[PDB]
Write a protein that holds these residues in place. Structure first.
Motif, mmCIF file in Angstrom:
data_model
loop_
_atom_site.group_PDB
_atom_site.id
_atom_site.type_symbol
_atom_site.label_atom_id
_atom_site.label_comp_id
_atom_site.label_asym_id
_atom_site.label_seq_id
_atom_site.Cartn_x
_atom_site.Cartn_y
_atom_site.Cartn_z
ATOM 1 N N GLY A 1 24.446 40.815 32.818
ATOM 2 C CA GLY A 1 25.673 41.493 33.257
ATOM 3 C C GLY A 1 25.984 42.782 32.505
ATOM 4 O O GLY A 1 26.319 43.799 33.114
ATOM 5 N N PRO B 1 28.369 32.617 32.322
ATOM 6 C CA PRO B 1 29.771 33.025 32.176
ATOM 7 C C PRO B 1 30.651 32.585 33.358
ATOM 8 O O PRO B 1 30.331 32.888 34.511
ATOM 9 N N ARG C 1 33.611 38.316 29.234
ATOM 10 C CA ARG C 1 32.426 37.749 28.550
ATOM 11 C C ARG C 1 31.164 37.633 29.429
ATOM 12 O O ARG C 1 30.665 36.519 29.668
ATOM 13 N N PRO C 2 30.646 38.775 29.907
ATOM 14 C CA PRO C 2 29.481 38.728 30.774
ATOM 15 C C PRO C 2 28.232 38.358 29.971
ATOM 16 O O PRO C 2 28.254 38.420 28.731
ATOM 17 N N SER C 3 27.168 37.986 30.686
ATOM 18 C CA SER C 3 25.871 37.710 30.095
ATOM 19 C C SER C 3 25.204 39.036 29.727
ATOM 20 O O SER C 3 25.662 40.128 30.115
ATOM 21 N N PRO D 1 31.035 43.054 36.034
ATOM 22 C CA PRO D 1 29.783 42.623 35.365
ATOM 23 C C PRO D 1 29.377 41.137 35.459
ATOM 24 O O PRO D 1 28.434 40.715 34.748
ATOM 25 N N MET D 2 30.059 40.343 36.287
ATOM 26 C CA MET D 2 29.543 39.001 36.575
ATOM 27 C C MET D 2 28.342 39.173 37.478
ATOM 28 O O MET D 2 28.377 39.986 38.379
ATOM 29 N N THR D 3 27.291 38.403 37.242
ATOM 30 C CA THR D 3 26.057 38.540 38.006
ATOM 31 C C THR D 3 25.752 37.196 38.683
ATOM 32 O O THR D 3 26.312 36.175 38.276
#
Ligand SMILES: [K+]
Ligand SMILES: [K+]
Ligand SMILES: [K+]
Ligand SMILES: [K+]
Lengths: 292, 292
Positions: free
Chosen positions: B114, A247, B109-111, A270-272
């Motif tokens: 995420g 993402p 649009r997180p994974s 929530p970005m990792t």
């Protein structure tokens, strides 16, 4: 500037997830030296989603300050509530930013009439030039050419950034608006095609790490040298695709760190963090573009 | 309570867009009298998008106050930044709400990783039960059964409201989670099918105006009396469809106004007034349901 290569700039952060001034300055210097036409500050790629409005405004004002009149700065101002879009926009009134990039409301899926009222109300509360931003894959909502035509009649709504990847929109919108209404791609992989059809530039993620090539490509495009532009585009195509392997902006931030442009690739949940497989994918695309 | 008919309640407003206490009281008394299992306060249908967190919290507290222990209240607590979700959740500690309904981050649009980290963090920092809410059409992302399975192992993640309308998800999720994990439909038109496949209830827009029929249909479904439930569902099916003829909650607020349940059908921008064609489509659905 609302022409040529416009970077959707990352918001570089320290390990705490707060804006890193040194890295921001480095990026802005890099864009000045590279011939980037303008900076979109705190849009999608700049993590507008995970910054509050105060932090968002802080980053924009810092970017404007660091630009120091050398490169125009466009503020991301999207909100899915009209009152909030107006409020965010007002923070930048009389600031030195040249315009706003304002997204269709996300999540609440307004009608085309609701889109018209949202953007009209926003335009009425500002003197700043407004660029509409359409990205249905993130918003659940699609601003159609007919409604763009309606809104183009509003004095300070001056352009659209079209991120659908649906190239038929260029001429459907162009048909419905005046010659000075700016048509910008919001999709790197199809952006050269978008310009070949009559588009005026790109709000680009690739430009974060390939600013010189991107600037050169859009100049060639604007002059009608498409065959020459395509050579650069094919050099950049793995980046246009692989910068979304995970993402956005997870890959482009890692790429920035790898190129030594920013101190850390930290992002807000929530970005990792990029996976190992992700690193190798982005590394190969950087290598293909000849950036290492 | 997290089974049966759960109403995704409208946030009734006066002409100025401010919450109308007298209309809310009426709606709440109506749900108490009609056998609704619980109220979801300030979710999607409650215009979570256009209330700030302070108005949001105010509406939930007012809902708890008016409910007065007669009906359980669940707060909408979704946010696309994890820190913000956590902060919003804290506002409801010891409030008296029975649980939270928390949407997958929208726009960014997180994974799956995420999403996992998002909901794990929210659950860590509260004792309140959490219901995951998946609605890709609004958010641009899709919480998949594998990830729901991982999250079900968190003590206070207790269920999911699945709003895809994709009925294969019921048993893909059910196989992965323990027998007490709650499966709720978030799609009125497929909700009875969802319950026949193993679902436990519905978070319903139609229940705003057909509370008793919804309550009875869900009880018959829970008892296995699917043919009996489907008779009710067939009379509600035009409502299930036509309450989305224009963007939710525009039709349902108009319907509430028409039945006399709320004083005005006012919404906040970017939501706009129902069109005349909308009025007639919705009127006909209400009559088919026996409500006018
Ligand atoms: K934000
Ligand atoms: K204009
Ligand atoms: K909000
Ligand atoms: K659990």
């Amino acid at each position: 500037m609302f022409t040529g290569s416009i970077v959707a700039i990352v918001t570089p952060m320290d390990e705490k997830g707060n804006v890193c001034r040194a890295s921001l300055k480095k990026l802005i210097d890099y864009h000045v030296a590279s011939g980037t036409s303008a900076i979109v500050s705190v849009g999608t790629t700049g993590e507008s989603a995970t910054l509050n409005h105060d932090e968002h405004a802080d980053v924009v004002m810092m970017t404007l300050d660091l630009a120091d009149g050398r490169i125009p700065v466009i503020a991301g101002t999207g909100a899915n509530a009209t009152a909030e879009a107006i409020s965010l926009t007002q923070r930048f009134n009389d600031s030195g930013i040249v315009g706003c990039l304002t997204v269709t409301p996300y999540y609440n899926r307004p009608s085309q009439e609701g889109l018209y009222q949202h953007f009209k109300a926003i335009a009425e509360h500002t003197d700043l030039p407004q660029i509409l931003y359409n990205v249905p894959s993130r918003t659940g909502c699609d601003l159609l050419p007919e409604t763009v035509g309606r809104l183009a009649k509003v004095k300070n709504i001056i352009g659209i950034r079209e991120a659908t990847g649906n190239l038929t929109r260029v001429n459907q919108i162009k048909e419905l608006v005046s010659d000075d209404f700016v048509l910008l791609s919001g999709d790197d992989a199809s952006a050269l095609d978008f310009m070949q059809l009559g588009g005026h530039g790109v709000i680009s993620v690739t430009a974060n790490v390939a600013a010189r090539d991107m600037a050169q490509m859009c100049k060639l495009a604007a002059e009608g040298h498409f065959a020459e532009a395509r050579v650069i585009n094919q050099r950049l195509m793995p980046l246009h695709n692989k910068l979304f392997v995970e993402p956005n902006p997870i890959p482009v931030k890692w790429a920035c760190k790898e190129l030594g442009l920013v101190a850390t690739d930290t992002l807000r949940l929530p970005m990792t963090p990029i996976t190992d497989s992700g690193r190798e994918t982005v590394r190969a695309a950087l290598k293909h573009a000849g950036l290492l």
